[PDB]
Write a protein that holds these residues in place. Sequence first.
Motif, PDB file in Angstrom:
ATOM      1  N   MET B   1       0.529 -63.643 -90.317  1.00 57.24           N
ATOM      2  CA  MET B   1       1.711 -63.684 -89.477  1.00 57.24           C
ATOM      3  C   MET B   1       1.387 -63.825 -88.021  1.00 57.24           C
ATOM      4  N   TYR B   2       0.264 -63.275 -87.589  1.00 60.57           N
ATOM      5  CA  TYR B   2      -0.121 -63.412 -86.210  1.00 60.57           C
ATOM      6  C   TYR B   2      -0.415 -64.859 -85.879  1.00 60.57           C
ATOM      7  N   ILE B   3      -1.176 -65.531 -86.740  1.00 60.49           N
ATOM      8  CA  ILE B   3      -1.612 -66.888 -86.430  1.00 60.49           C
ATOM      9  C   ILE B   3      -0.645 -68.021 -86.859  1.00 60.49           C
ATOM     10  N   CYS B   4      -0.176 -67.994 -88.124  1.00 64.18           N
ATOM     11  CA  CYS B   4       0.598 -69.019 -88.821  1.00 64.18           C
ATOM     12  C   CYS B   4       1.883 -68.422 -89.379  1.00 64.18           C
ATOM     13  N   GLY B   5       2.602 -67.680 -88.570  1.00 68.58           N
ATOM     14  CA  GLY B   5       3.775 -67.072 -89.137  1.00 68.58           C
ATOM     15  C   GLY B   5       4.707 -68.129 -89.656  1.00 68.58           C
ATOM     16  N   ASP B   6       5.029 -68.012 -90.932  1.00 67.76           N
ATOM     17  CA  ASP B   6       5.921 -68.906 -91.645  1.00 67.76           C
ATOM     18  C   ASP B   6       5.617 -70.402 -91.496  1.00 67.76           C
ATOM     19  N   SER B   7       4.342 -70.772 -91.525  1.00 71.19           N
ATOM     20  CA  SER B   7       3.974 -72.180 -91.464  1.00 71.19           C
ATOM     21  C   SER B   7       2.987 -72.546 -92.539  1.00 71.19           C
ATOM     22  N   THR B   8       3.453 -73.349 -93.483  1.00 66.73           N
ATOM     23  CA  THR B   8       2.660 -73.737 -94.627  1.00 66.73           C
ATOM     24  C   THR B   8       1.466 -74.554 -94.224  1.00 66.73           C
ATOM     25  N   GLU B   9       1.677 -75.487 -93.319  1.00 63.33           N
ATOM     26  CA  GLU B   9       0.593 -76.362 -92.918  1.00 63.33           C
ATOM     27  C   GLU B   9      -0.520 -75.594 -92.207  1.00 63.33           C
ATOM     28  N   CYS B  10      -0.148 -74.643 -91.315  1.00 59.45           N
ATOM     29  CA  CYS B  10      -1.061 -73.812 -90.559  1.00 59.45           C
ATOM     30  C   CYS B  10      -1.824 -72.923 -91.548  1.00 59.45           C
ATOM     31  N   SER B  11      -1.118 -72.349 -92.515  1.00 62.98           N
ATOM     32  CA  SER B  11      -1.765 -71.485 -93.474  1.00 62.98           C
ATOM     33  C   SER B  11      -2.841 -72.234 -94.241  1.00 62.98           C
ATOM     34  N   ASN B  12      -2.545 -73.456 -94.654  1.00 64.26           N
ATOM     35  CA  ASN B  12      -3.521 -74.202 -95.413  1.00 64.26           C
ATOM     36  C   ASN B  12      -4.763 -74.520 -94.602  1.00 64.26           C
ATOM     37  N   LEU B  13      -4.613 -74.620 -93.289  1.00 66.25           N
ATOM     38  CA  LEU B  13      -5.767 -74.820 -92.451  1.00 66.25           C
ATOM     39  C   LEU B  13      -6.544 -73.506 -92.316  1.00 66.25           C
ATOM     40  N   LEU B  14      -5.864 -72.355 -92.370  1.00 62.00           N
ATOM     41  CA  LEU B  14      -6.591 -71.087 -92.289  1.00 62.00           C
ATOM     42  C   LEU B  14      -7.485 -70.895 -93.465  1.00 62.00           C
ATOM     43  N   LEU B  15      -7.117 -71.449 -94.593  1.00 58.54           N
ATOM     44  CA  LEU B  15      -7.903 -71.295 -95.802  1.00 58.54           C
ATOM     45  C   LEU B  15      -9.282 -71.915 -95.666  1.00 58.54           C
ATOM     46  N   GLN B  16      -9.480 -72.759 -94.674  1.00 59.66           N
ATOM     47  CA  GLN B  16     -10.744 -73.422 -94.535  1.00 59.66           C
ATOM     48  C   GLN B  16     -11.745 -72.489 -93.892  1.00 59.66           C
ATOM     49  N   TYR B  17     -11.275 -71.337 -93.436  1.00 59.02           N
ATOM     50  CA  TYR B  17     -12.082 -70.353 -92.755  1.00 59.02           C
ATOM     51  C   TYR B  17     -12.438 -69.182 -93.666  1.00 59.02           C
ATOM     52  N   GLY B  18     -12.179 -69.340 -94.954  1.00 59.05           N
ATOM     53  CA  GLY B  18     -12.620 -68.347 -95.913  1.00 59.05           C
ATOM     54  C   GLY B  18     -12.081 -66.937 -95.777  1.00 59.05           C
ATOM     55  N   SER B  19     -13.007 -65.993 -95.676  1.00 62.10           N
ATOM     56  CA  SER B  19     -12.711 -64.570 -95.609  1.00 62.10           C
ATOM     57  C   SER B  19     -12.402 -64.009 -94.245  1.00 62.10           C
ATOM     58  N   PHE B  20     -12.360 -64.808 -93.194  1.00 62.27           N
ATOM     59  CA  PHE B  20     -12.116 -64.136 -91.920  1.00 62.27           C
ATOM     60  C   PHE B  20     -10.885 -63.219 -91.899  1.00 62.27           C
TER      61      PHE B  20
END
Lengths: 49, 49
Positions: B1-20
Amino acid sequence: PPEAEVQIDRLITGRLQSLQTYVTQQLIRAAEIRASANLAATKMSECVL
Amino acid sequence: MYICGDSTECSNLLLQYGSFCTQLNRALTGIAVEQDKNTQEVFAQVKQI
């Protein structure tokens, strides 16, 4: 070559961040265990000896 | 929620960062647990009221 350099640099940055994160956590945890060791040493001296 | 609150596209990019995100959650949980532990160590020293 230049296409790879962009992609390689991206992985390098990500991996360096991971190592820095790891080390920082180990330093903090090390301080914690040291405090325990100091307590243990105090008890050894005061209660065993 | 801090980084990609309610954004599907942003969330999918976060997944590229693994376990952070997981690591951040664990660190804060560890602190929260510790804070209740500290309170108990200071005040709950007797088991008789």
